[PDB]
C-alpha cells in the first residue's frame, strides 16, 4: 500500500482527475514561478490523491509541452508534490495555451480510463502567445468541452491573455476564470478554488 494520511483538515475526496497546467514563459520571473510551484503543490497538500479518489497530472508548457506528472502515476501523494515543487523553469519566450490545450485533449484525455471522475484541467496563465498559434485555440476547447474537461483559466499578471481566458469562459458555464494581479495572490483565492473544483466532482458511492 503505497499512500499516505491527509496534511490537512481542508482536503478534496471527491472523483476527480485534476490537471495543472504551469505558464513555462518568461512572464513568470525565476522567482514568481517558484510560487506558482507552491500555489500548485499546497492545491495537492489539500487534495486526496490516489487512483481512486483524486489523480493529479502536472505540466509545464511554453513552445511545447512538458509533463512530469501523469494522471495515472502510481507514486505517493508526497512524491508527485516534490515532482511538482522541483519542476524546472523554462523561462521562455513563447508559454502556447492552444498547444497545450491540445496536449490535454489529445493526450491526457485522449480517452476516458475513468468516466466517473470529473476531468478539470486548471490552466495557469501569465502570457499570451503569438496570434499565429492560435488558429485551433477555440477547437481544443470546444474539444475539451465535448469531453467534459472543465477548463478553469487562472489569469495571473497584465500580460495574461484576457481574451482566451474569456472565451473559454464562454464555451461551457463551469468554465470559471479566476483574474489575478500576481502569483502574490494565489494563496489567498486557492482554498475558493479548489472548493469549486472539488463541489464539481462525484462524490464516492457510500461505503457498502
Given at each position: 500500500?503505497?499512500?499516505?494520511?491527509?496534511?490537512?483538515?481542508?482536503?478534496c475526496?471527491?472523483?476527480?482527475?485534476?490537471?495543472?497546467?504551469?505558464?513555462?514563459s518568461?512572464?513568470?520571473?525565476?522567482?514568481?514561478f517558484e510560487?506558482?510551484?507552491?500555489?500548485?503543490?499546497?492545491?495537492?497538500?489539500?487534495?486526496?490523491?490516489?487512483?481512486?479518489w483524486?489523480?493529479?497530472?502536472?505540466?509545464?508548457?511554453?513552445?511545447?509541452?512538458?509533463?512530469?506528472?501523469?494522471?495515472?502515476?502510481r507514486?505517493?501523494p508526497?512524491?508527485?508534490?516534490?515532482?511538482?515543487?522541483?519542476?524546472?523553469?523554462?523561462?521562455?519566450?513563447?508559454a502556447?495555451?492552444?498547444?497545450?490545450?491540445?496536449?490535454?485533449?489529445?493526450?491526457?484525455?485522449?480517452?476516458?480510463?475513468?468516466?466517473?471522475?470529473?476531468?478539470?484541467?486548471?490552466?495557469?496563465m501569465?502570457?499570451?502567445?503569438?496570434?499565429?498559434?492560435?488558429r485551433?485555440?477555440?477547437?481544443?476547447?470546444?474539444?475539451?468541452?465535448k469531453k467534459?474537461?472543465?477548463?478553469?483559466?487562472?489569469?495571473?499578471?497584465?500580460?495574461?491573455?484576457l481574451?482566451?481566458?474569456?472565451?473559454?469562459?464562454?464555451?461551457?458555464?463551469?468554465?470559471?476564470?479566476?483574474?489575478?494581479?500576481?502569483?502574490?495572490?494565489?494563496?489567498?483565492?486557492?482554498?475558493?478554488?479548489?472548493?469549486?473544483?472539488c463541489?464539481?466532482?462525484?462524490?464516492?458511492?457510500?461505503?457498502?
Amino acid at each position: 500500500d503505497i499512500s499516505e494520511p491527509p496534511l490537512h483538515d481542508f482536503y478534496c475526496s471527491r472523483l476527480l482527475d485534476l490537471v495543472f497546467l504551469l505558464d513555462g514563459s518568461s512572464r513568470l520571473s525565476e522567482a514568481e514561478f517558484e510560487v506558482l510551484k507552491a500555489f500548485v503543490v499546497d492545491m495537492m497538500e489539500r487534495l486526496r490523491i490516489s487512483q481512486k479518489w483524486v489523480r493529479v497530472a502536472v505540466v509545464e508548457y511554453h513552445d511545447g509541452s512538458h509533463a512530469y506528472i501523469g494522471l495515472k502515476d502510481r507514486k505517493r501523494p508526497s512524491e508527485l508534490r516534490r515532482i511538482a515543487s522541483q519542476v524546472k523553469y523554462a523561462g521562455s519566450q513563447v508559454a502556447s495555451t492552444s498547444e497545450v490545450l491540445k496536449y490535454t485533449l489529445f493526450q491526457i484525455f485522449s480517452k476516458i480510463d475513468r468516466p466517473e471522475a470529473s476531468r478539470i484541467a486548471l490552466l495557469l496563465m501569465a502570457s499570451q502567445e503569438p496570434q499565429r498559434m492560435s488558429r485551433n485555440f477555440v477547437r481544443y476547447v470546444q474539444g475539451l468541452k465535448k469531453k467534459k474537461v472543465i477548463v478553469i483559466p487562472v489569469g495571473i499578471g497584465p500580460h495574461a491573455n484576457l481574451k482566451q481566458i474569456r472565451l473559454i469562459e464562454k464555451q461551457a458555464p463551469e468554465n470559471k476564470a479566476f483574474v489575478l494581479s500576481s502569483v502574490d495572490e494565489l494563496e489567498q483565492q486557492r482554498d475558493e478554488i479548489v472548493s469549486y473544483l472539488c463541489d464539481l466532482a462525484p462524490e464516492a458511492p457510500p461505503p457498502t
